[PDB]
Amino acid sequence: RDVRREQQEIITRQINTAPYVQDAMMRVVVFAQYPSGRYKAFDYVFPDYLKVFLNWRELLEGSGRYPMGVIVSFNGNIDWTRARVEATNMHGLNNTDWREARAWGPHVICGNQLRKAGHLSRAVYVPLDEHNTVKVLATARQNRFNGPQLAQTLTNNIVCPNVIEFNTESDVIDYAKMAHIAYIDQAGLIVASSDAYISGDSQ
Amino acid sequence: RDVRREQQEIITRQINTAPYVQDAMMRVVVFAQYPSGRYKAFDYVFPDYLKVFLNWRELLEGSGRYPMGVIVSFNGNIDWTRARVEATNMHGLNNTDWREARAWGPHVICGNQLRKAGHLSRAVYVPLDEHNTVKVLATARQNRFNGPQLAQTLTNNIVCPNVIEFNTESDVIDYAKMAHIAYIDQAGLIVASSDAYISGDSQ
Amino acid sequence: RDVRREQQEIITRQINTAPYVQDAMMRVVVFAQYPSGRYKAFDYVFPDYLKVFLNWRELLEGSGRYPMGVIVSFNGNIDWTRARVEATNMHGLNNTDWREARAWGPHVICGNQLRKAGHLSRAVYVPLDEHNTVKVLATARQNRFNGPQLAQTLTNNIVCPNVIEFNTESDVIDYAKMAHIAYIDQAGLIVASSDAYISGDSQ
């Protein structure tokens, strides 16, 4: 009877389900917070996998200040059992002595450290101190990494980075809402999500 | 009898055939055209595959102007059935809503949209508007992407980018001729090619 | 009896052996030497493989001078049979004519051209002239590149680059000693190494 409603329901479902298709895009954003109240975002869209290393100079604010921390926003059909973040030293090392450092540290940020912001999204806050660097790994949920599919995955995976400067958190927040990505505001509230709702937050 | 001629013929053939050897170099160039009449070239040489994303700030002219469009020049033993280009939005997305965007769009630039500039070369003009971004994919013609060869291909593939600024199209044109790469001049003529001719354009 | 000594011996061994674990970090550094007496270092840490192309503008000193040459320092569980360096032209080509250029040149720098600086380290000096570019390849000693392991290797390999400016060679030298990496001083002496010694250079 109410096919107008049914169609809108299917559209909502479609939006929530499209990211699970094999060549769907994923979106990871690293929001850097500065004492000034300003933010800088490193926004990555990618279809298969993302490996990020933000060096200490990239993390600096225009004024030259280092960030208090980052909000790392994971969005899409990401394998949550392998999604991870760690704050390394100025050299990108998780042990001061490189001879005993590894690809990832024994206390890498993962598991339930990533907060649920919807079925499509996780977010985590990571405090930083001076000269810290940031590493992020996100991979598509399995396999495109097996045997013959690995070839297409390698050549198909074009990571598209953007760096965005925000004057205030309000700008970050509205950016996140309109980009449909998880964000955690300064009070710790989840104020943006990838999940589409047919009536918004009506309940 | 005329072995001097035969040898020159073999040299011509060798030049035209060398790019088809498995570890041969390929060359893709993105020529950005600005209203000023100036051009900027993103010149990539690579042995196996190339994935390019040019962000909106990279595409800007020194003055700060955005390009009218790009000429994408494909050269070498490229798989023409998979070679492609697309103009994405400022975020590198082919759908404004990332949740319904994909690795490549439903109308990606490919097939006979790429103009033949010789057996070794294709070229295509792509008009751009403000904040557009550019994505290019080029892969070596099959397999180096199969099973055990994929390992060497991954580690062997060092993409060597150069960014070159030109004052006038004449500079672009002579650059393309001497670099043996396809280029399409402002009148739409193919004025450069990778194909070697023993007597030049003598017919 | 002397378990204090034994433990220190095991610690020394552990430091020397840790880099051979499958997810251990490797470290490659390209030290650029300028006529000014200043140096610039491109310092890479990575777990699986490293592909480097330093373009001519990256190689320039702040003043705008080109380097006299580079010291390439290889450290870790590197496959010394495949480790290599070459100085290409401004375009990253090992043949002026790209149609006859290849992934690596017929006289690529490898084998015993790399000087032994310990069981963990090799180093080589490479003179450069204006507009030369530099290519480096280093891979973990086998296999993580075979079949099903290639997937993890691809996603696990986050290369962490740092660019460091030094005022004098003395600064470079002490940097190399404290970073436990091979370096060859201006007299040609090996003055730094990754190898840990329980009593230092006491013999």
Author numbering:
A (entry chain A), B (entry chain A), C (entry chain A): 13 to 75, 110 to 188, 193 to 253
Give the article text:
To ensure the delivery of virus particles to the target intestinal cells, allowing the transmission of packages of infectious virus between hosts by oral-faecal routes, polyhedra are disrupted only when they are exposed to the very alkaline pH environment found in insect midguts. The fold of all the polyhedrins is highly similar – a β-barrel core sitting on a base domain, surrounded by a common array of five helices (H1–H5).
Base domain deletion mutants of CPV1 (CPV1Δ) and CPV4 (CPV4Δ) were produced by three steps of PCR using primers encoding a Gly-Ser-Gly linker (described in). To test this, polyhedrin proteins were made with the base domain removed by deleting residues 74–110 of CPV4 and 71–103 of CPV1 and replacing them with a flexible Gly-Ser-Gly linker (resulting in CPV4Δ and CPV1Δ respectively). The CPV4Δ structure was very similar to that of CPV4 with the larger unit cell. The absence of the base domain did not influence the overall structure of the trimeric building block but increased flexibility such that the electron density for 40–50 residues in the inter-trimer contact areas could not be observed. The base domain is therefore a region that is neither required for proper folding of the protein, nor for crystal assembly, but fine-tunes the crystal, ‘locking-down’ the structure, often in conjunction with NTPs. The deletion mutants are much more sensitive to alkaline buffers, even those such as glycine and borate which do not disrupt crystals of full-length polyhedrin, although CAPS could not dissolve any of the samples effectively. We also find that the whole base domain is dispensable for polyhedra formation, although the biochemical features are altered dramatically when it is removed.
